[PDB]
Ligand binder design. Structure first.
Ligand SMILES: [Mg+2]
Ligand SMILES: [Mg+2]
Ligand SMILES: [Mg+2]
Ligand SMILES: [Mg+2]
Ligand SMILES: [Mg+2]
Ligand SMILES: [Mg+2]
Ligand SMILES: [Mg+2]
Ligand SMILES: [Mg+2]
Ligand SMILES: [Mg+2]
Ligand SMILES: [Mg+2]
Ligand SMILES: [Mg+2]
Ligand SMILES: [Mg+2]
Lengths: 112, 54, 154, 104
RNA sequence: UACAA
RNA sequence: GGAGGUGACACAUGAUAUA
RNA sequence: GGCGACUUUCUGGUCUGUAACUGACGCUGAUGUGCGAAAGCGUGGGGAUCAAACAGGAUUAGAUACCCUGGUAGUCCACGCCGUAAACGAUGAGUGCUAAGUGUUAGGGGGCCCCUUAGUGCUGCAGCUAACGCAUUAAGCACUCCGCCUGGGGAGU
């Protein structure tokens, strides 16, 4: 039984991943678009992200979690959908996208 | 006047809510003042008087 | 068309059941402008329905049509190298069109000898949530919910 | 009638005639002794055609309403300067005026 | 059109 | 309105002159 | 060519004002001598990221590619070498003269504005231009010196 928690959202252009934990960082339940049998372009849709945070939150509340914080990441479109649905699963809502200070060289641009 | 890196209260006025140095087109400072401002803020960040990223 | 929408034509209610939906059904039945044959089939089918079911033919026919009319459809779309079947909501006037079209089309494929027999059995079947026209609606929803992720296209 | 346009737009050839610039009132008086609708292109250089419209105006209601209304001035000067008097403000070119009045 | 194949 | 910086599936080929 | 976290040390140049000083001591510059992006080479270190070659997976009629997953040299440092780029403003250097308007960088003088130096931009006369355009940062008007050109290909062989 844990009541205070943190919800991590990792939304990219290929997949949305949600991990729920306390403030101590130890996870309790996670889901993703792939865990719901979505493949490819389906795995990145904003609708398909909400089906993942809803699944994740229901498992964390089963442990007894009521208040969870939000840490969002990535430019994936499944950001509002995965965050609003956090408040839509009986969870009380009380940006961590890594930016470098000019560090490592990024890969070459794609000539599609 | 010469800007001191110890004067954190004056410096905080020119940083943003994430600790970023504010552009001079926003604060209205002149070019030479903004250069002195930038050196003092970077000095003060090193001495932990001001944050890098909050 | 490119310019815009075109006004639609009203129809008269049928003389027996005072129903515009019944008139539209006769037009779907009708081939080559032969309206008398289409009316004869429709009214004979409704007599078969009323006695094989025990209820009013019109009341059974509205139940049957409600089980054929779809709420969601799929639309073809070209999206940069991948055709996507976008699910859309069927407008109320198109719902009646598809309900009547599927009812007649799948009554024509049945094995009863006369069309009045085939139409009456399709209506009785669709009023029990079975038959070819109800299955066709089910497969349309089954194609749509398999693409409800693609609702974000237009 | 002697306050010209703003300094940031004054032509350099009006220095003798000239915050904002104030015209030469003293010089305009000595110059004044020496001296409403759109201007159609070719009013003077195409009188071989305009006069037909002038004649056709004298001699339909839709045309006449605009014709009566008809029959900044750079078009007019060219029609005259090319054929070989006017108020000339600071922003206006004085070198193309035979009788320039340097009044606002 | 005159050619080429 | 016009410039300068900034950023952002697949589709092969078609003889010579004269035209 | 290039140079972007901050600190110290060593060190080059420029700009403004002044008018102590020297008194034409200047300009240009063949030959020469140096500096010179990136790739590359040698010796020795280092090796996160990225990534020629390469491997696999795709696509395709084929795909020695473009896309994906990896990945070596290399990318980094020191010391040598190499001496080339659309090394571009495709505009050699010096000096003076020739409308204006308007931003901006570093100063000075006077009453935020006016004047004035030196840079850096835009617009725009005269003039120039084949045109595009240039136009006090000239591609205008002049004098000095240097480099270079003389149809295309062959061939920068
Ligand atoms: Mg200096
Ligand atoms: Mg020299
Ligand atoms: Mg030489
Ligand atoms: Mg190198
Ligand atoms: Mg690769
Ligand atoms: Mg090496
Ligand atoms: Mg070296
Ligand atoms: Mg050259
Ligand atoms: Mg020169
Ligand atoms: Mg000169
Ligand atoms: Mg110009
Ligand atoms: Mg200047």
């Amino acid at each position: 039984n844990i009541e205070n928690g943190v919800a991590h959202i990792r939304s990219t252009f290929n997949n949305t991943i949600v991990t729920i934990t306390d403030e101590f960082g130890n996870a309790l339940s996670w889901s993703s678009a792939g865990a719901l049998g979505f493949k490819g372009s389906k795995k990145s849709t904003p609708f398909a992200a909400q089906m993942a945070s809803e699944t994740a939150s229901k498992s964390a509340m089963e442990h007894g979690l009521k208040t969870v914080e939000v840490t969002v990441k990535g430019p994936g479109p499944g950001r509002e959908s995965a965050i609003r649905a956090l408040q839509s699963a009986g969870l009380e809502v009380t940006d961590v996208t890594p930016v470098p200070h000019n560090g490592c060289r990024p890969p070459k641009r794609r000539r599609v | 006047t010469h800007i001191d890196y110890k004067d954190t209260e004056l410096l905080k006025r020119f940083i943003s809510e994430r600790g970023k140095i504010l552009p001079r087109r926003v604060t209205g400072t002149s070019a030479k003042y903004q250069r002195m401002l930038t050196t003092a803020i970077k000095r003060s960040r090193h001495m932990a008087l001001l944050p890098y990223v909050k | 068309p490119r310019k815009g929408s075109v006004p639609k034509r009203d129809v008269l209610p049928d003389p027996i059941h005072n129903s515009k939906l019944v008139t539209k059904l006769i037009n779907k039945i009708m081939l080559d402008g032969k309206r008398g044959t289409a009316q004869r089939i429709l009214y004979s089918a409704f007599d078969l329905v009323e006695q094989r079911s025990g209820r009013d033919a019109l009341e059974v026919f509205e139940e049957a049509i409600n089980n054929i009319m779809p709420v969601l459809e799929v639309k073809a779309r070209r999206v940069g190298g991948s055709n996507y079947q976008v699910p859309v909501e069927v407008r109320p006037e198109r719902r009646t069109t598809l309900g009547l079209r599927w009812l007649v089309n799948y009554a024509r494929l049945r094995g009863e000898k006369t069309m009045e027999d085939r139409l009456a059995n399709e209506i009785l079947d669709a009023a029990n949530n079975t038959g070819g026209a109800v299955k066709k609606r089910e497969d349309t929803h089954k194609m749509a919910e398999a693409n409800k992720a693609f609702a974000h296209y237009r | 009638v002697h306050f010209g346009h703003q300094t940031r737009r004054w032509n350099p050839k009006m220095k003798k005639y000239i915050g904002i610039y104030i015209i030469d009132l003293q010089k305009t008086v000595k110059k004044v002794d020496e001296a409403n609708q759109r201007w159609l292109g070719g009013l003077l250089t195409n009188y071989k055609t305009i006069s037909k419209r002038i004649k056709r105006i004298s001699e339909l209601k839709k045309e006449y309403d605009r014709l009566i209304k008809f029959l900044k001035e750079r078009n007019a000067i060219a029609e005259a300067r090319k054929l070989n008097v006017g108020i000339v403000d600071t922003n206006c070119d004085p070198d193309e005026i035979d009788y320039v009045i340097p009044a606002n």
